[PDB]
Symmetry: C5
Subunit: 346 residues, 5 copies
């Protein structure tokens, strides 16, 4: 007997199957087990506060109206053009801004009905999901992107979602990201919605993302640090070399300015202060203060033996004080952002 005629009898008008009535309509809620396989993961954008995934979504439930014994085969397959003939959960992604199915060559959908009446429903789909990002502590930030699977119009006494016990979320191997590192550890949560209509089932997965630091260190932090060190070389230059020390001071300020202005195009465009901005501002205040130190020495020197000794003391004190206070700033900045502000992801 052909499997298509058996499906016509099983879900036909003589069977009285109604795709608008959930299984076990009188009694206990439908339990739906969910798996997710992530094929790709990227397009993490701060301007729109979202990211993009391409996933396989598998749902399994039981429909006792679909149990069959007559047919020899253990499973039946429904055509992806007639999926509207069967009841399916009204799952939706609660933080989704845009999404689409896939249809090139045949429909990228699959549905199997087993003898006991269990239904397996696997689809492939692309999502744009919202994630709020902080971006304070920016070079050394860690973000948490979530994915929520909610029911649209069924309360928790009608429909319940559950994560599969063995392996609910899997990620394909070899994936890479231009900016982040997707950690291996993933959170499976329960975020049941309490509204006025009632309790609505919602399960959730959290992914942890750590930004890489090698580019920011090698292109922004170390060049700024070398410019700051270069500003300290004014203190070892002869006191009477005004064109040398003044030109070195102001050119160091200009170099500091071009370094920050060129860095500005690569950084995320936000309106609040980030850790990198704190670093750039302090390095600018350091090269600004090294030029004010020479302005003080140059003015105190010309007042016409005591004045020359007093001017030379500001130089020898500045030779130790400026590196020391920059060391203390370094210690504080790195501990605050690598240890204090750094917190458990959970």
């Amino acid at each position: 007997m052909s499997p298509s005629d058996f499906l016509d009898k099983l879900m036909g008008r003589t069977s009285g199957y109604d795709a608008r009535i959930r299984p076990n309509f009188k009694g206990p809620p439908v339990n739906v087990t969910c798996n997710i396989f992530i094929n790709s993961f990227g397009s993490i954008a701060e301007t729109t506060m979202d990211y993009r995934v391409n996933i396989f979504l598998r749902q399994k439930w039981n429909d006792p109206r679909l149990a069959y014994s007559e047919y020899p085969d253990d499973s039946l397959d429904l055509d992806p053009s007639m999926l509207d003939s069967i009841w399916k959960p009204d799952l939706f992604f609660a933080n989704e801004k845009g999404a689409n199915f896939h249809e090139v060559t045949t429909d990228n959908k699959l549905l199997r009905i087993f003898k006991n009446g269990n239904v397996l429903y696997s689809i492939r789909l692309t999502l744009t999901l919202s994630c709020p990002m902080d971006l304070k502590n920016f070079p050394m930030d860690v973000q948490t992107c979530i994915m929520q699977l909610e029911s649209f119009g069924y309360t928790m006494n009608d429909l319940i979602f559950e994560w599969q016990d063995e392996a609910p979320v899997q990620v394909a191997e070899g994936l890479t990201l231009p900016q982040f590192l997707l950690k291996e550890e993933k959170d499976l949560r329960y975020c049941t919605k309490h509204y006025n209509t009632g309790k609505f089932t919602c399960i959730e997965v959290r992914f942890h993302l750590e930004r890489q630091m090698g580019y920011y260190l090698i292109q922004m932090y170390i060049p700024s640090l070398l410019i700051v060190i270069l500003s300290w070389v004014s203190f070892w230059i002869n006191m009477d070399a005004a064109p040398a020390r003044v030109a070195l001071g102001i050119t160091t300020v200009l170099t500091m300015t071009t370094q920050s202005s060129g860095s500005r195009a690569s950084l995320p465009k936000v309106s609040y202060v980030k850790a990198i901005d704190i670093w750039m501002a302090v390095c600018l205040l350091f090269v600004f203060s090294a030029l004010l130190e020479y302005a003080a020495v140059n003015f105190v020197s010309r007042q016409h033996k005591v004045f020359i000794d007093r001017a030379k003391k500001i130089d020898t004190i500045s030779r130790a004080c400026f590196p020391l206070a920059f060391l203390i700033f370094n210690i504080f900045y790195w501990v605050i952002y690598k240890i204090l502000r750094h917190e458990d992801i959970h």
Copy 2:
């Protein structure tokens, strides 16, 4: 009895229901109560003068042709594929440039009919809504984005929209924006359209948005201020140090130029003057004038005791005058844009 056959009888050919005829066709207008829940909020663009939202829109009205008593259950649910079998208000968003429904997994729509005949109709949808922005007073600007809910072809003697009394507009928690801060206080308004055809119902919500200032202060205002202070250090340098004072003056002008040119890529692209532009222009005029002050001192000095004293007086006067006039400018700029130009949002 199955709920789908009861819906077939209630809105069937034997019932004579007509989805093109509004409820209470002879008499009083249909009153529609609206709620909005904002899931996400962002993509605020000045180049297109618009922003993007993802919302739940709930409408409630009464249809006395849909009242039922026979059925045991208190509510009935209509399938989202047969929504064209029921009358619905012809709501539209009057400032919408682009919009779309959501359809991944099942249709993201819901409709419930109660025994009294009340209809609840909840849909989920994405909008791109226009908002004119001013962007004068730019770092310290405040914008007001609106959302208008109008009827398309019904006059106010046929269809009236009302905001729900308890909570018409709600925003989900945890939302963030790269540039703005969405205030908690929201305006519910009435913007009834008066045309030649008649009065058309239109209700409106206003959201208030305040730009954050920390980045603009730490990266644009303070570095410009330090460059201006650095231009004043020419006045404490010996009068006969022409290569030092001239090179410091012109390098300060170049640093000022690179600071503004690098800042130009991050700012909004508009053709009129913004407050930041006023600040950048005055700081450029200050470093330009400090170099002209040395050109005057250098020319007045060489005229061959009176000429040297006269040249030294321009220096000692400039040491107090330049910071003072920059202080007065600062006071005026900050009061005009933080107090005077700042106005009540209503």
Copy 3:
């Protein structure tokens, strides 16, 4: 009697109405009166030579097959799902590169049939319309965007479009543009197409757009002018100060270069010369020539009393000649682009 059954009788099979046959099929052409209401206006792009509008388009004509007397009501409304049951003009936008209807909540369309048989057909739609831009005279340019309403397959002995006498094109209040100013005065034209098939009706509207100049003046023209003035301060510096005058000259050239290079990212990307480019090139030639003037003075001075006097004369002549020739250039540039090249918009 229900209005939908009357519409079924009026445009039914017993009526013999044919939506493929124009009204007055044997005789005079159909006259269609058009209104346009512009809801939004923006996205004016030079890289694609186009702009974007969101409009209401209203068309009115007479169909004597649709005249009714039996029905009590003065007007009837057709459902936007059955618009293919009535004849409509085959209007299209002749300079349209992309366009779409609007469908969120109900269809954004409307059609009313009056007793005399007059039809009113109002739709809402988004357009991307092409406009060729010149962009010579760029800071001070004025553009004219048009909108053409043509018939696709009807000649002028079958279909004629007319602008409404009272108010054919209206613009909503409060619209703003980041770059331009939409003038209040609008042109209503006739651009009848003459082809080999015959005369085709086409009506047209022109909108006038004037670029704002405040940003370009405050950020590009005035800073360039101050750099040019700063290059003239070399002439008041002592002749024997070679490191001062040479370093001021070359740093002025570098400042001029960074000013133009930073300006280059904000300007439109075209391959021909614009007025701003003429200004930048002349200011570069001025700071280049001020450094060549010192190279001539420095070379003429060292030739070992006549040579020192001759070198001092080039300086005192240059102190008047360089500002004068820059004044003449300013006068010519501003009159040519503000008066001569500026022409009547019509």
Copy 4:
């Protein structure tokens, strides 16, 4: 008699017309005459190697099954909703990456059947067509964009395309391009495909595009040339002026660097060398070599009368040699790229 019933009889079930069977199914191939009218032309992108057009495409052929004599009128018009009732050629654009029809207001399609049976089929459509670009010789490059009209599944013994004799490709007046100039001369070609299945008809049009040079000359070539000339002014400065000549040399190198770095954002992003890159590299080697010339003079001078004379000879030789070798480079560069590399477009 109504024209729609005559079309129902002519292409009806009683007529036996089959829209899947080409005209003259037993014998000679169908000859299809093609016209193209180009409404707009732009969006020429090197990052995707493509351009965008909006065209009218007219096809004419003969179908002897559609010949009619009974009807009084000379032509009949088919409704654009029933175009699937008639045989049409399976034309496609062989280098098309993306394309779409136009549908706002009515369908932008037209089909006329004459008494002899000739069919005229005119449609309006947007194309994104691929064109490989070279971009070597970049400021002075010339590109050739093609458009190929192929059959998809008919061999040359069934379907043949021909260009119309009188005017096959026309361009609307007033079109402009931000970067190129579309030449008036166009090539009509035959690019018949030879495959394993057989010969497939394919006709082709080539458009010639010449880049404009005014911006590149006024903003990149002339400023670089002035910087090179400014580097030669070191040779007329006194030999003992080490801070002047060294600072002028290195600031000229820095100015050269900022000029190239600012130019880099406007140029096309490719991985191979372009003519502009050759020019920028040689100008950098010239300002680099002028500073090495002073390093040689400064070192040869201090060796403690012969050494001072020998050092002065390198200066006077460099005053003539550096402009001469830059003139020879200019002559060679301009002849190679304007004459030698420049080739006939055919």
Copy 5:
């Protein structure tokens, strides 16, 4: 007899053909032979880790239910509107993020059925396929883009894909890429998926892409190398020329900074270190160290004959040591990235 009626009989209700039942339903798996012809290839993006292709995909299999002998012709053609009447493999692209068919003018699809029952099915389609990129070793990187052809719901005992023996993947001539060079050698692989459901057929093609280096060499590597050489010219300048050597040192550091900052906008935006970044960092450390060498010489010199000789020895040692250590760095960098890190593509 018309070919369409024969197709109606062959795949009709009297024939009992079922498009949901694969050929040879009881026994051996269906063998599908695949060809790919690549029409275009580009849009290789690192921000989304993907590339774009436009291809012809040909599949051939055997369906013994479709064998015919009565008809005179050797082949039959199915209409692209009735492709759902025939069984087709459920191929899909396993690394596809987005894809679409082509439909302008007729459907870009083709299907032929031969007498033996062999089916040939050729379609044209656009793909966006994911490829993970490394981008370490960035100027000199080599990437491998793959394309996987998998079955969606058939195991390897039902459906097997095979590459055609003669020529499975062909590329059209004349294709170019702005950044890469598509090598001629291509890998045909077998990447059979082993899941819990069973073995799923999957065939794969790898394309090899080598980045071109001419732009990076002429615009980034050589200018950086000339700046490094210019920093060595401080060692041949007189020891007592503090304003010359200090200003040359710091201006060389500033030039190095502007060169890197201008280069930053063209490079790919990633968070890890690339080979170019290593080169830029070492060149910055070289110009930084040349200025520290003068700070050491200037400090050791003024201590008041032994001190002047000791200071002159650091200069003469640095004249050989700095070029030598830069040569060793060059040798190591170029061998590590051109030879060691360079590996066989397989």
